[PDB]
Amino acid sequence: VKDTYTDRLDDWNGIIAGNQYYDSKNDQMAKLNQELEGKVADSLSSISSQADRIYLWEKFSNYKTSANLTATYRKLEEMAKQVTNPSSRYYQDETVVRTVRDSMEWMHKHVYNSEKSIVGNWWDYEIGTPRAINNTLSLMKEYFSDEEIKKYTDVIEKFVPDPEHFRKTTDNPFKALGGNLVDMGRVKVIAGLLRKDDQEISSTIRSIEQVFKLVDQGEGFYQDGSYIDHTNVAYTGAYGNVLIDGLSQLLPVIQKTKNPIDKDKMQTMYHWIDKSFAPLLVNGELMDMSRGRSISRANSEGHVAAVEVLRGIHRIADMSEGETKQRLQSLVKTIVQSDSYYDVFKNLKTYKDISLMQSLLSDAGVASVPRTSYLSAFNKMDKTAMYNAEKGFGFGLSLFSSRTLNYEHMNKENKRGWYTSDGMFYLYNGDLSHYSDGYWPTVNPYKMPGTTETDAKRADSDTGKVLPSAFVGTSKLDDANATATMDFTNWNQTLTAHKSWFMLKDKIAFLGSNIQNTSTDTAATTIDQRKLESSNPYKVYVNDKEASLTEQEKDYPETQSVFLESSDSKKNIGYFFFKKSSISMSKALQKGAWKDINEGQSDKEVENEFLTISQAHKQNGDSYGYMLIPNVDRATFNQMIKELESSLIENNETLQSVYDAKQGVWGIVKYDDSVSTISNQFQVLKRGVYTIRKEGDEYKIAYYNPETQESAPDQEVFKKLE
Numbered sequence: 101v102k103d104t105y106t107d108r109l110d111d112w113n114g115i116i117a118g119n120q121y122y123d124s125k126n127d128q129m130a131k132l133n134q135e136l137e138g139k140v141a142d143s144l145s146s147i148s149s150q151a152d153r154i155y156l157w158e159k160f161s162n163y164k165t166s167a168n169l170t171a172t173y174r175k176l177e178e179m180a181k182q183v184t185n186p187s188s189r190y191y192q193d194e195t196v197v198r199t200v201r202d203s204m205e206w207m208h209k210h211v212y213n214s215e216k217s218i219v220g221n222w223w224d225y226e227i228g229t230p231r232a233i234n235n236t237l238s239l240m241k242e243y244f245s246d247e248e249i250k251k252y253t254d255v256i257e258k259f260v261p262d263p264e265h266f267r268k269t270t271d272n273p274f275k276a277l278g279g280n281l282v283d284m285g286r287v288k289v290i291a292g293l294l295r296k297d298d299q300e301i302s303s304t305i306r307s308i309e310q311v312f313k314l315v316d317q318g319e320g321f322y323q324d325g326s327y328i329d330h331t332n333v334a335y336t337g338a339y340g341n342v343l344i345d346g347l348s349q350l351l352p353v354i355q356k357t358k359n360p361i362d363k364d365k366m367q368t369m370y371h372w373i374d375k376s377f378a379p380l381l382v383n384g385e386l387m388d389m390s391r392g393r394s395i396s397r398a399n400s401e402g403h404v405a406a407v408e409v410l411r412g413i414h415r416i417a418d419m420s421e422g423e424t425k426q427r428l429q430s431l432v433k434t435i436v437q438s439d440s441y442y443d444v445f446k447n448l449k450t451y452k453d454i455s456l457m458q459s460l461l462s463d464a465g466v467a468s469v470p471r472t473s474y475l476s477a478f479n480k481m482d483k484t485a486m487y488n489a490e491k492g493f494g495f496g497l498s499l500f501s502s503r504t505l506n507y508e509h510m511n512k513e514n515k516r517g518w519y520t521s522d523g524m525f526y527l528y529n530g531d532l533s534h535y536s537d538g539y540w541p542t543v544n545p546y547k548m549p550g551t552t553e554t555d556a557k558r559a560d561s562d563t564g565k566v567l568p569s570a571f572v573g574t575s576k577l578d579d580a581n582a583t584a585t586m587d588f589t590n591w592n593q594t595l596t597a598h599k600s601w602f603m604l605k606d607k608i609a610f611l612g613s614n615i616q617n618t619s620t621d622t623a624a625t626t627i628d629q630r631k632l633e634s635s636n637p638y639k640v641y642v643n644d645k646e647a648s649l650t651e652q653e654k655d656y657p658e659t660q661s662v663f664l665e666s667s668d669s670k671k672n673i674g675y676f677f678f679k680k681s682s683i684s685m686s687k688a689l690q691k692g693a694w695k696d697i698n699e700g701q702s703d704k705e706v707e708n709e710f711l712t713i714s715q716a717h718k719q720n721g722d723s724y725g726y727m728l729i730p731n732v733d734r735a736t737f738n739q740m741i742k743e744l745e746s747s748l749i750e751n752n753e754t755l756q757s758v759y760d761a762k763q764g765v766w767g768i769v770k771y772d773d774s775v776s777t778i779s780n781q782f783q784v785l786k787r788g789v790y791t792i793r794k795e796g797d798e799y800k801i802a803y804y805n806p807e808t809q810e811s812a813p814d815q816e817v818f819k820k821l822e
């Protein structure tokens with residue numbers, strides 16, 4: 101029956117598919133249409149048309165595997181999209197209409213109904229499938245009776261009757277929050293509209309409002325921009341994605357129901373965008389350190405994942421007004437145009453999303469100015485993101501502590517992320533494809549960049565762990581300078597190291613001290629493991645003399661510097677060792693398959709060439725110290741290392757500090773409360789992290805105690821001499 105409920109469903113259809121905006125003369129849209137045409141065509145030619153079939157699609161036949169249910173229903177949603185698209189060859193096609201109706205009935209009688217119990221993954225039974233069912237019925241509501249719709253959605257009410265909890269029919273339900281809570285809306289709000297159930301709609305919207313509250317513990321968004329999910333995992337880039345992506349779709353519909361959400365409550369959305377999401381986006385790429393186990397998915401590499409956030413932002417901009425709308429449009433525009441590697445349209449899956457992106461990009465009224473420099477210390481999730489606009493490089497520092505899990509391996513995904521948070525670092529430069537094109541299934545998991553580890557074998561069956569120490573954190577001074585440390589202990593408590601980082605605007609110093617090993621395994625710190633481009637080869641220099649790297653590891657004793665020279669300076673990487681160090685390097689083709697790190701992925705062999713730089717630690721009390729200097733040519737790197745000749749102030753078991761004379765900035769990490777005199781100019785008095793700047797006779801201080809997660813009054817930690 102046509103009423104206010106169907107009106108809302110019409111708006112929903114315009115959002116999830118957008119057929120009403122389709123334009124055959126629009127190349128980007130025609131491209132998505134053809135994709136859907138192909139998908140439906142394939143589904144129609146492989147579906148079982150035999151009586152007494154045991155499945156609809158052979159490749160999704162074993163229904164004891166919950167994933168097959170969601171995949172099956174999603175195939176029906178694709179059909180519903182095309183049968184209602186005037187420009188589709190399947191528009192109002194009698195066979196497709198009957199196929200969708202008959203398929204819904206079959207699955208309802210033999211595979212998914214209220215008389216069933218969760219078998220496999222609860223996610224499919226409560227989120228994946230219900231969403232596919234809602235969208236199918238919503239798109240084809242003019243081909244189904246209200247009774248049939250209520251019939252096919254009853255099962256949704258059986259598995260998800262409570263808008264505040266998930267796994268309600270199991271022996272271990274959980275409180276819905278963040279991304280899941282948004283999906284709860286895409287389940288119960290839509291089902292509610294389909295069932296014309298006001299109570300379900302009102303109660304679900306009320307439950308959804310919890311998402312707008314910032315937290316100070318648990319899952320959710322924090323004031324410092326961090327986003328935690330799954331109890332204690334940094335997850336802005338995956339579950340955070342689902343949250344903004346899904347919520348931006350729902351809001352236009354929710355705000356037109358009899359239970360609209362207060363404007364002041366939704367105000368936090370803008371905080372997420374500016375404080376939580378934006379910093380993790382560099383040249384169109386969403387930083388992998390925030391994507392959890394999703395890094396092990398071939399179809400979700402960095403630039404692809406970024407689009408989920410960008411399209412969410414764009415939708416929010418569209419429902420916003422004036423300056424707020426104007427600036428969000430500019431944010432999306434500048435990020436997209438800075439991405440010369442990935443075509444944003446490849447992940448805009450609805451015509452309205454394509455339309456919005458096109459108008460934004462062609463509207464001269466929307467400014468597209470390169471983003472300025474920034475540095476976000478996401479202490480509540482132990483990650484740090486840095487971007488230098490003048491030089492054009494991004495830097496990501498992935499850590500963990502007693503407050504966060506190192507890596508997430510579940511549902512057979514991300515089997516080898518063991519060391520992705522053990523002081524791992526990311527460098528975002530001219531090569532936007534670096535962490536893409538199969539980086540994850542080909543990178544050597546035992547040598548993640550920046551990490552200090554023993555070479556003991558690791559089991560894929562292992563799961564994440566929290567760190568024994570709480571002494572992990574970043575002290576930020578300004579948009580270009582910050583200091584961080586990690587009181588590191590490896591997975592089996594056989595190795596330790598005081599690892600610290602000194603972010604000094606256009607370079608980052610890496611210092612490690614108190615390195616100890618109690619095992620029989622060899623210990624080493626991976627200085628880098630950079631994925632190469634066959635089109636842009638690097639010329640390697642050691643102590644400024646060209647070197648020839650081979651697959652076989654070569655040792656370089658008494659090394660003062662290493663320089664990776666590209667034809668594009670924005671891809672150059674230099675390493676300056678404060679004190680001559682013994683390192684080894686090699687360039688080798690590494691092979692692997694996505695299935696190796698994610699059971700549900702392809703076993704197709706992938707290959708990439710990598711340049712690995714390492715420093716062995718054969719004695720207790722060992723250390724390392726070097727400055728990472730990117731985006732400068734060879735002569736400029738050589739000049740810079742001369743300026744930094746005496747930048748290392750100290751690197752021992754209780755004190756680590758680097759000084760940038762040009763800036764007048766000090767980065768300092770103290771492991772105890774002894775009085776530390778620095779450069780005969782001042783004293784720092786407490787255990788913690790410092791970033792200090794001298795401006796004449798003045799001193800600007802940024803102190804952070806990572807264990808108590810508090811700063812402190814200046815006189816408690818700093819004292820000027822004389």
Ligand SMILES: CC(=O)N[C@@H]1[C@@H](O[C@@H]2OC(C(=O)O)=C[C@H](O)[C@H]2O)[C@@H](O)[C@@H](COS(=O)(=O)O)O[C@H]1O
Pocket residue numbers: 167221223224228279338339342394400408511700
């Ligand atoms: C945040 C996350 O990893 N969520 C998991 C699901 O993944 C998301 O799926 C969708 C969607 O519209 O369904 C959008 C996102 O890009 C993607 O991250 C999914 O993996 C389900 C079930 O698993 S599967 O059978 O292995 O595919 O589990 C969620 O936790």
